[PDB]
Amino acid sequence: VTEVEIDGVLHEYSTKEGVQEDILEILLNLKGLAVRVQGKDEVILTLNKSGIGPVTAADITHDGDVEIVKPQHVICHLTDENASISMRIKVQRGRGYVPASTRIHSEEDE
């Protein structure tokens, strides 16, 4: 996971309506994710879910060439039934460790 895009958010240190984990907790639990793409080298997934209960990794509306190999990876704990969450993840492919500070100016595509 490289870029996470949640709707109705300002920064990662805010909080959201209807969830348990805070947004830094959500970003950590998304950093632990294990994805296996086949054809492309950069894909965009989608997670949309409402209702009371935990948000597994098995709730992501998969495409054809992406395979999420951990169907019990928890991300959120939605508590309000009127709460919703719609995040759009971006999954690149590389090696080593490239962090946010160096990837703050390295990124060319404005």
Partner: protein, 99 residues
């Protein structure tokens, strides 16, 4: 068999789409027919370019609609469904048709 009609204005984009579709097909199912290029529609237009009058003054535009016919011979359980989540790049109208 699933016939797939890709239509787009940009040819490169269309090509990219086609490849992607093939990839999607080939991992899940087996015996993808192939990316067959149909004839391109070159819909031309002439217009007078003056605001008022000068009739020999003209611009001749066109829109090149490209066609790609991809066919899938064996629709399995896994394969057909894979396209639902697998949306293609924008500016490429796809048209799947089983049988």
């Amino acid at each position: 068999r699933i016939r797939i009609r890709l239509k787009a204005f940009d040819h490169r984009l269309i090509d990219q789409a086609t490849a992607e579709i093939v990839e999607t097909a080939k991992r899940t199912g087996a015996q993808v027919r192939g990316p067959i290029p149909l004839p391109t529609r070159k819909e031309r237009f002439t217009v007078l370019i003056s605001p008022h009058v000068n009739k020999d003054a003209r611009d001749q535009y066109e829109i090149r609609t490209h066609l790609r016919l991809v066919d899938i011979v064996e629709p399995t359980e896994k394969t057909v469904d894979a396209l639902m989540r697998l949306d293609l790049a924008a500016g490429v109208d796809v048209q799947i048709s089983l049988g």
